[PDB]
């Protein structure tokens, strides 16, 4: 799709560097608008970044740090909204790019708008043309007090701008790298313009620049894009008749999704009464799931019923991992509003309070769990337990909150033999990262493509047990598993049962008249009768 979601890993080193590049390729390829932060970190000199070439807009900040690449193709990057800021002040951070490797030219020849935040460029031994740019023109009129911390500590000489650059302001050595002013040359009080003339002034709702005086000639929208039209607000979903003021539905009504107006909220998103698309309901609301599959947020007049929150939400907002001091708060939870993280510190207790470490038996609390809204992060797991079968009833991981803004399912450094997530049939969003699990098999026996809900999703896997070793031993899907799809060994891990599933075990045929209490058939499920 045209819209992708950024990341949130910052300067933190990638757990799986062998798949770190394949992550970025799956997230941003074809993506034009980045909802969130564009973080490009720890990329080798031989990296192909040709998937970044379509990115026009970044909502959060842009982090380019610790890279060996000489070129980062962001020539189409038109605007950085900076709703989030690196270290809370910078909308564009370019740090420690080097080790000849090292960033040579920024080449942001379309970047003409930064709505909020400053620019941080430091410790780039190969970077040029950084100090040749009038950054005061890129910053918005409401952001003229934006900081600028730029270091020209170079270890190489730099050729001047191409003779075409009037004023010698460039993003590189080419003629196309010339910086096009769109603020400092405007006539009157224009925030943005296409020239020094008052007729060249652009509409107030335009952001990056204009091609005409219309509010449909913008390069970017200051607030919302209403189908080629830049507007302050989206058309409300409700129209009030000026007599009696009864609320009637608006046919032109639109939901606010990012900086654009949509007719219907995208997948895995919720619709509110205000008329917006969110991943989290407002205070004192409940998620009403329609029968067609769509979910919405509805406000409650009477105080809402007790809801089970996961990590990162409400009273578990600042809690790093699931321990034995919060394990009982997931008891009886069918749906968890938040995330579940299992770090090594989960299974070591608290001697000072005589609190026993989390026991493998207590993990059976999650047996009632059927849905996670956030993500599932497992970096530690009891060596005794051969699989994640305590989540055997888990059906959906929404991924409305992602680990490092990227992964909805992370399994790393575990001693599990198989997965055992027999009920998991959907990963609403985010990537899946399953790496460095020595004894783990039955990974390629999982129809991962069936679980994903968008093409920006994939499974990043490495350093697990070789499939050649798995098939060498008798570790294959059971005969009753349809199309060879299973989460583990035995007929109790089949994704699709070829015929007649009894209880949790797949059999070849139920005993309708064979002796086992005349088991009657009800939708491929064997059940006791009389």
């Amino acid at each position, epitope marked *: 799709t045209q819209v992708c979601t950024g990341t949130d890993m910052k300067l933190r080193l990638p757990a799986s560097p062998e798949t770190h590049l394949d992550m970025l390729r799956h997230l941003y390829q074809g993506c034009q608008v980045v909802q969130g932060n564009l973080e490009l970190t720890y990329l080798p000199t031989n990296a192909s970044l040709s998937f970044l070439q379509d990115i026009q807009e970044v909502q959060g900040y842009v982090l380019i740090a610790h890279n060996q690449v000489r070129q980062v193709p962001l020539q189409r990057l038109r605007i950085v909204r900076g709703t989030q800021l690196f270290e809370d002040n910078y909308a564009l951070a370019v740090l420690d790019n080097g080790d000849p490797g090292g960033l040579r030219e920024l080449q942001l020849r379309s970047l003409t708008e930064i709505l909020k935040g400053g620019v941080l460029i430091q410790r780039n031994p190969q970077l*040029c043309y950084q*100090d*040749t*740019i*009038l950054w005061k023109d890129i910053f918005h009129k409401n952001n003229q007090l934006a900081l600028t911390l*730029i270091d*020209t500590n*170079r270890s190489r*000489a*730099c*050729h*001047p*701008c191409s*003779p075409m650059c009037k*004023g*010698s*302001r460039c993003w590189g050595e080419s003629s196309e790298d010339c910086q096009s002013l769109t603020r400092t040359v405007c006539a009157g009080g224009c925030a943005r313009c296409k020239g020094p003339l008052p007729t060249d002034c652009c509409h107030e709702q335009c952001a990056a620049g204009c091609t005409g005086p219309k509010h449909s000639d913008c390069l970017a929208c200051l607030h919302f894009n209403h189908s080629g039209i830049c507007e302050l607000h989206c058309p409300a979903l409700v129209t009030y008749n000026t007599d009696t003021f009864e609320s009637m539905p608006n046919p032109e009504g639109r939901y606010t999704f990012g900086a654009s107006c949509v007719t219907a909220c995208p997948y895995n998103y919720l619709s509110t009464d205000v008329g917006s698309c969110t991943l989290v309901c407002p205070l004192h609301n409940q998620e009403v799931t329609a029968e067609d599959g769509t979910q919405r947020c509805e406000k409650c007049s009477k105080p809402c019923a007790r809801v089970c929150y996961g990590l990162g939400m409400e009273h578990l907002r600042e809690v790093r991992a699931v321990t034995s001091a919060n394990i009982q708060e997931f008891a009886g939870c069918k749906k968890i509003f938040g995330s579940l993280a299992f770090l090594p510190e989960s299974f070591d207790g608290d001697p000072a309070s005589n609190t026993a470490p989390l026991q493998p038996e207590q993990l059976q609390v999650f047996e009632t769990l059927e849905e996670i809204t956030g993500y599932l992060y497992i970096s530690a797991w009891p060596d005794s337990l051969p699989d994640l079968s305590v989540f055997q009833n888990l059906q959906v991981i929404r991924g409305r909150i992602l680990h490092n803004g990227a992964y909805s399912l992370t399994l790393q450094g575990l001693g599990i033999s198989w997965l055992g997530l027999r009920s998991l049939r959907e990963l609403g969003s985010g990537l899946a990262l399953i790496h460095h699990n020595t004894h783990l098999c039955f990974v390629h026996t999982v129809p991962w493509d069936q679980l994903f809900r968008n093409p920006h999703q994939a499974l990043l896997h490495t350093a697990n047990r070789p499939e050649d070793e798995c098939v060498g031993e008798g570790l294959a899907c059971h005969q009753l598993c349809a199309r060879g799809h299973c989460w583990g060994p035995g007929p109790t891990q089949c994704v699709n049962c070829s015929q007649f599933l009894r209880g949790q075990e797949c059999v070849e045929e139920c005993r309708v008249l064979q002796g086992l209490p005349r088991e009657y058939v009800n939708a491929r499920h064997c059940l006791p009768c009389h």
Partner: antibody
Amino acid sequence: QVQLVQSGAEVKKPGASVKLSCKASGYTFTAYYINWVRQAPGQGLEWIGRIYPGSGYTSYAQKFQGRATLTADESTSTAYMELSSLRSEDTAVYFCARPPVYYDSAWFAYWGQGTLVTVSS
Amino acid sequence: DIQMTQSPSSLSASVGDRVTITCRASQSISSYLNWYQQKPGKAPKLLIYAASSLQSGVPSRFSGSGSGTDFTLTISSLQPEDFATYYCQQSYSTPPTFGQGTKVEIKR
């Protein structure tokens, strides 16, 4: 010809300010760093700061981070060096130079006919 | 700041003789040294930039060499037109510093 013409060879009162101009011609003025080097009578060279016209980016030394303001005009092609508070030790001949080929390199060719500045009462 | 020291401070030689001006740095410089020629009443001229690399227009009798701590400016054939105070400049880090100068005066 590529030339730099300086003006303002005068004497100023100790404590006052002084704005020395550096006219440029023969090349694209905004394409190269215009740095300033001073030299006291019968002394060595001392580097003050550099400035890139077209952007206005400046780089000063720790000795002149409080004074020595640098500017630039694309329309008049002038560097306009300016000290704030003069001392008896600030009596020198101020030059404006630029790199030959590269714009940011720290070797200076194409100097200008410097202007001497005397600071006495 | 990196302190640059030259040697000697003053020098005298006849026309045709060779001149060896040694420049010492108080820090390891990776051949980021520059040489100049300031005649009395005039602005300096870039003789040899970045150690060995000679400047266009400058006579070929001017050669530069050295790396790290010590360097060397060399005039294969001294001429009466070579009367000036010679400075060395480091271009390693801000701020670029100069030497005290070597006032070489020829002999007749």
